[PDB]
Amino acid sequence: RYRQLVNSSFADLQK
Amino acid sequence: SRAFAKDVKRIVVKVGTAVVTGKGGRLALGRLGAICEQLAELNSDGFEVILVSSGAVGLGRQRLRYRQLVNSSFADLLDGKACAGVGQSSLMAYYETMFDQLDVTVAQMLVTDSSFRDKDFRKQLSETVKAMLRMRVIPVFNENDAISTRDSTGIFWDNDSLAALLSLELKADLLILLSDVEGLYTGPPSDSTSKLIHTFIKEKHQDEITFGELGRGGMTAKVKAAVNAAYGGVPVIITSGYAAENISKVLRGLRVGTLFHQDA
Amino acid sequence: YRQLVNSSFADL
Amino acid sequence: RLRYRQLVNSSFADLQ
Ligand SMILES: Nc1ncnc2c1ncn2[C@@H]1O[C@H](COP(=O)(O)OP(=O)(O)O)[C@@H](O)[C@H]1O
């Protein structure tokens, strides 16, 4: 979790 | 047969969220384009078309999504009334921008549930639509989900029942509804026990066909709207929107889709 | 970092 | 413009 977002491109978070 | 097809003057076409919106809640620029292209071409032939749109919910939702995400913090670890506002803005934008490519002018006329109970509002709308659809102007109707609070008229008053009633009110014919399936299958399309029907007999079919299992609209409302419009005196044809050239074949004297007429 | 943790893509 | 385009595809770990 934390790590996932820690290393993600915001555009991705939109996924 | 399809003898009524050759002699229609005022045609109404309705597009649901199943066709206007594609994957990722993004306007299906493809289908939405091809169909509006063909509609502009058809209007350039002198016909009088009526457009009903249903994609406010989805586009709205996506846009709000983005706007929220743009302003969020670690939250990465919506009310329709707004979704619809933004969705309508966007849909109307696309329709216009796309229709300005063929010098076809469209005016957005929006109706609400608490408006069709008035005795003279129907007459006023009839006169204004008749006046507007004379200089090759295409009007666009859609349920105004923003102001909407909720029997009114039309069950669940989705765009299907709205289109059926509106075509029943204004003297017109050939109610065309665009879905993602190539007609009214007698059953679920996935199952092999499902065959397309050329026609529709009220007493033979309605009792025994069984179906059911898309924010705007919903099946089992389409059939009721079609039957209550056809028994009112307006022919109804159902055809898929995945091939926008289908409607041109409909309006030439060729048999595709399902029928709903006063005949038996 | 805690700052970045607390911001908006808009913020950046 | 292009800055926005990039940020969009950037990973938090790259904004440091
Ligand atoms: N009798 C049937 N024949 C074919 N398809 C059906 C039938 N009943 C339900 N469906 C499917 O159910 C779905 C419901 O969507 P529909 O209400 O038709 O469009 P929208 O949700 O845009 O109003 C349709 O996509 C359709 O394919």
Swiss-Prot record, chain B:
Q: Report the coiled-coil segments.
A: none
Q: Which UniProt keywords apply?
A: Amino-acid biosynthesis, ATP-binding, Kinase, Multifunctional enzyme, NADP, Nucleotide-binding, Oxidoreductase, Proline biosynthesis, Transferase
Q: Name one GO cellular component term.
A: chloroplast
Q: Where is this region: Glutamate 5-kinase?
A: 1-264
Residues binding ATP = S179, D180, R216, G217, G218, M219, T220, A221, K222
Q: Name one GO biological process term.
A: embryo development ending in seed dormancy
What is a single molecular function from GO for this protein?
glutamate 5-kinase activity
Question: Which of this chain's residues are annotated to bind substrate?
Answer: S54, D145, N159
Q: What does this protein do?
A: P5CS plays a key role in proline biosynthesis, leading to osmoregulation in plants.
Q: Hey, which family's this protein in? A: In the N-terminal section; belongs to the glutamate 5-kinase family.
What is the name attached to this protein's record?
Delta-1-pyrroline-5-carboxylate synthase B
This protein's species is Arabidopsis thaliana (Mouse-ear cress)
Source lineage: Eukaryota, Viridiplantae, Streptophyta, Embryophyta, Tracheophyta
Task: Please name the gene that encodes this protein.
Answer: P5CSB
